[PDB]
Structure formats: C-alpha cells, structure tokens
Design a protein around this nucleic acid. Sequence first.
DNA 1: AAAAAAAAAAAAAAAAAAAAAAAAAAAAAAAAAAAACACGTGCCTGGAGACTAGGGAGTAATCCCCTTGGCGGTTAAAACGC
Length: 49
Amino acid sequence: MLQFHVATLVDNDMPGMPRAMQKSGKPLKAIKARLKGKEGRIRGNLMGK
DNA sequence: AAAAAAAAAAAAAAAAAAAAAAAAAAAAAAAAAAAACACGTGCCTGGAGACTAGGGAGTAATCCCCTTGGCGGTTAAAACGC
C-alpha cells in the first residue's frame, strides 16, 4: 500500500494498476497529469501563458 | 438515594480507432565435438614349389553266383454290394 500511494503520487495513469480514489468520484490528478496534456503546465502554462 | 444497562446523537473512515516500438515464443539452419565397420600397416605362420617313392586305384581276364524270366495250382487276398 505504501508503494501504491507512492505510485499514485507519481503516476495515476498506469494501466494494470488500481486507480486512486478521490472524494468526489474522480481519479487523482498526479504530477504527470499536471505536466503532460494540452492544458498542462508545459503546453497550457509555459507554452501558452 | 446510588449503580448498571440500553437507546440515540456525534465523530472518524473507505468507497474509441490507429500506428510505431519492444518483448517473446516456435522454428530452423549452420557449425563444432564423441562413436565405428573397414581401411592402412607390419609381422609371421601358413601357403606354395620341387623331388622322391610308394602304395592305392585303374585296367585286363574269368566265373559263378546271383539275379531275372516264364508256367502252372489252389487260393487267401482283394473287390463288390447291402
């Protein structure tokens, strides 16, 4: 479970790995979700601020 | 009048299609080491050549013994039938 919490802190988009459960019925938004994506920290905040 | 048990309110907690790259399994040919009937080699014991001389087999004559051939008399053996 410690490895599960560490992995979901790092990457919650890993297939074959149980998704982290948030309080509002959503998956947890990890740091990879903050960076990778069109609306991410790179494309939506550094590329397109 | 004081102690114990059940009921209810409050608080904490788990619950979509497409394409490139890599890993992997079945297969498959190529190439490098241990066996094994017959070939390579040297030795020798047996195969081969020559002379002697003799004794066992072939050849000639004879005969008589053994083998073959015929003719007749019941006749037991064979054949035929029910």
